[PDB]
Enzyme design. Structure first.
Site, PDB file in Angstrom:
ATOM      1  N   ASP A 184      45.215  30.575  42.094  1.00 15.94           N
ATOM      2  CA  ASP A 184      46.376  29.895  41.530  1.00 15.94           C
ATOM      3  C   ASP A 184      46.309  28.389  41.778  1.00 15.94           C
ATOM      4  OD1 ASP A 184      47.866  31.979  40.188  1.00 15.94           O
ATOM      5  OD2 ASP A 184      48.539  32.746  42.142  1.00 15.94           O
ATOM      6  N   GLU A 199      43.890  29.773  37.070  1.00 22.43           N
ATOM      7  CA  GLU A 199      45.173  29.315  36.500  1.00 22.43           C
ATOM      8  C   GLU A 199      45.107  27.803  36.311  1.00 22.43           C
ATOM      9  OE1 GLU A 199      48.791  28.642  38.943  1.00 22.43           O
ATOM     10  OE2 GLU A 199      49.955  29.904  37.605  1.00 22.43           O
TER      11      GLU A 199
END
Length: 659
Positions: free
Chosen positions: A329, A372
């Protein structure tokens, strides 16, 4: 551009006592076997090691020695800044530290003061009781996990070749996975939700919010303890069984890995661990920036022991928990020196390169990694032999915004078909993509899901089966199914769905927090609507299961891009082909079409394999699925053959070739 990745690898391979050469796997395995705390089952000794260069003396304290600050001093640091201690077995022959008791390491700082920390490689940590919290606040507590019987894996990893196989991903959160206002557990997921995901047919589960974090309404993004799976849902053995079980089901399990930033917490987190501003993180005076969305701290990837820490962390989750791969992330904030508001951070990039090497060396030809990245940085998802970052996939974060603009501002007569096709197909070659039509943030308070934009407050009175659909409800159900399917088939190389949107969940999602009086009323998932037969929510859920199982039999995701043949601006119809299969959509507000021509490139006979107007999906059953569609040998819409279809106002279908 820079060769930090290769320099760092030579040092790894000759870091041996005699100077002889070793491998990168041997480096990271010997590290998680040598650092932290380890019990010896034959002599009952215990060894502990801990890197803390700013500290002068180190003492192990906890319930096992009544928090005594003098009796268990570790041996002097070696030339690498690491303290070490061997604990003899007790005079009765037992381990000196009891199982799941509380422990801390205490450091004496250069100024003589004292700080108290959870050891950095601890494997468990827990939220405090209401009594402890009134006194000492909300700080978490660390535990020594040494059970009498560790879980023994019984199943092999599922057969999977990354280069050849497709992956469809169900994005989930353990705590909100019930209709009750509460926090649900690992075991409840294993028994009650793993069967729903197997019914829907996904290949993999993306577990959010697993690395431990104290602030619940952060959705998992503010991490405190990196070698500890989260305790608000259960124990380390509970999770190994959850993964062993998914593995028996043939399901891969991936971990949301947050290596982009850390919580600002000090005692239960890594901020100021050894007393200093410059151990794991960059100092504030370095002016190396801040995360633009989360109040947080950022890592120093150039330190040899930080490379050992994060790389051993990856090998530990693979070996000890049998995870199969990772989603990283916050990649957009790691890649740039301004963290996303075009100048690249090469130390953060070199760490991700070595991380991809280790992970693929551990599981040759099987491992998975995902990024991401809002920005869309080129070469991120190309292999290392070609200079790339080494990621296998990225997320397609721009798609949900196209649908909101359409419903807010345009009359139905004025929808633009060519704009819809362009947005879905614009991706970079060689860099595979995960597509979706609404995100986990759109489901929150202050925002609107797809369902609410379509039908508004009439969802609270007219979603009943008992009265014939009003004009507003008939329009709304049809469009909700059509939007998911065109995203799944035209938009990427893998798929993703957020928990609850597969059935048009009404209202919004909200965690307990200061502004709602810590209310759990919206911190849940109304799975009970799917089970109620007086309402129309189950119509949307049954459509989703049929979509996923269609792909596993007739592969279309992990294949080359589609060829598009139609997008008509007065009739409102779209059509295309992919991996040898065929797809068609009608968006006109009042008119239905008889004998509409559609183009096709390989001659043969075709049969429908999916249809949105089925009564079981809420439709009116106007379409006959037993029809054989023979190809006519005449060019059409730039293909070598064509077929003819009937498609009512607001419906869609998919077809394949009979061998």
């Amino acid at each position: 551009r820079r060769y930090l990745a290769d320099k760092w690898l030579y040092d790894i391979k000759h870091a041996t006592p005699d100077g002889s050469e070793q491998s990168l796997v041997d480096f990271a395995r010997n590290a998680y076997k040598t650092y932290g705390l380890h019990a010896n089952q034959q002599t009952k000794e215990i060894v502990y090691r801990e890197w803390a260069p700013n500290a002068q003396r180190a003492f192990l304290v906890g319930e096992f020695n009544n928090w005594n600050e003098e009796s268990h001093e570790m041996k002097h640091k070696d030339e690498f800044g690491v303290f070490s201690i061997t604990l003899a077995p007790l005079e009765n022959g037992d381990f000196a530290i009891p199982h799941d008791s509380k422990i801390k390491v205490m450091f004496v700082l250069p100024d003589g003061s004292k700080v108290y920390r959870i050891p950095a490689w601890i494997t468990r940590a827990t939220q405090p009781s209401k009594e402890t919290a009134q006194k000492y606040g909300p700080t978490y507590e660390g535990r020594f996990w040494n059970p009498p019987n560790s879980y023994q894996f019984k199943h092999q990893r599922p057969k999977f070749n990354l280069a050849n196989d497709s992956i469809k991903i169900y994005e989930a959160h353990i705590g909100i996975s019930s209709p009750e206002p509460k926090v649900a557990s690992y075991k409840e997921f294993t028994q009650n939700v793993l069967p729903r995901i197997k019914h829907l047919g996904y290949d993999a589960i993306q577990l959010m919010a697993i690395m431990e974090h104290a602030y619940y309404a952060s959705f998992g993004y503010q991490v405190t303890n990196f070698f500890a799976i989260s305790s608000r849902y259960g124990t380390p053995e509970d999770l190994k069984e959850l993964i062993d079980t998914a593995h028996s089901m043939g399901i891969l399990v991936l971990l949301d890995v947050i290596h982009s930033h850390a919580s600002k917490n000090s005692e239960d987190g890594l901020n100021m661990f050894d007393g200093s501003d410059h151990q794991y993180f960059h100092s504030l005076t370095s002016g190396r920036g801040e995360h633009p969305l989360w109040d947080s701290r950022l890592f120093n990837y150039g330190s040899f022991e930080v490379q050992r820490f994060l790389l051993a962390n990856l090998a530990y989750y693979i070996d000890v928990y049998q995870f199969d791969g990772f989603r990283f992330d916050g990649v957009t904030s790691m890649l740039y020196l301004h963290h996303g508001v075009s100048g690249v951070d090469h130390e953060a990039l070199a760490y991700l390169m070595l991380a991809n090497d280790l992970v693929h060396d551990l599981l040759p030809e099987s491992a998975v990694t995902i990024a991401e990245d809002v920005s869309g940085y080129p070469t991120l998802c190309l292999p290392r032999t070609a200079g790339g970052g080494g990621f296998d996939y990225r997320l397609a974060m721009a798609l949900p915004d196209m649908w909101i603009k359409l419903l807010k501002t345009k009359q139905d007569d004025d929808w633009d078909m060519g704009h819809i096709v362009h947005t879905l197909t614009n991706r970079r070659h060689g860099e595979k993509v995960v597509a979706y039509c609404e995100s986990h943030d759109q489901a929150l308070v202050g925002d609107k899901t797809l369902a609410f934009w379509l039908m508004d407050a009439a969802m609270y009175t007219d979603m009943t089966v008992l009265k014939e659909p009003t004009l507003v409800i008939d329009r709304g159900i049809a469009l909700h199914k059509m939007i998911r399917l065109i995203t799944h088939s035209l938009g990427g190389e893998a798929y993703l769905n957020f928990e609850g949107n597969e059935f048009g969940h009404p209202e919004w999602l909200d965690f307990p927090r200061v502004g709602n009086n810590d209310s759990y009323h919206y911190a849940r998932r109304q799975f009970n609507l799917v089970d109620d037969d007086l309402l129309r929510y189950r119509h949307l859920n049954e459509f989703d299961a049929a979509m996923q199982n269609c792909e596993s039999k007739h592969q279309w995701l992990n294949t080359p891009q589609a060829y598009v043949s139609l997008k008509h601006e007065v009739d409102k119809v779209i059509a295309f082909e992919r991996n040898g299969h065929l797809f068609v959509f009608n968006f006109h507000p009042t008119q239905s079409f008889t004998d509409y021509r559609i183009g096709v490139d390989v001659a043969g006979t075709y049969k429908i394999v999916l249809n949105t107007d089925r009564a079981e999906f809420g439709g009116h059953n106007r379409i006959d699925e037993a029809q054989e569609f023979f190809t006519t040998d005449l060019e059409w819409n730039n293909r070598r053959n064509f077929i003819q279809v009937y498609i009512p106002s607001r419906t869609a279908i998919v077809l394949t070739r009979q061998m």
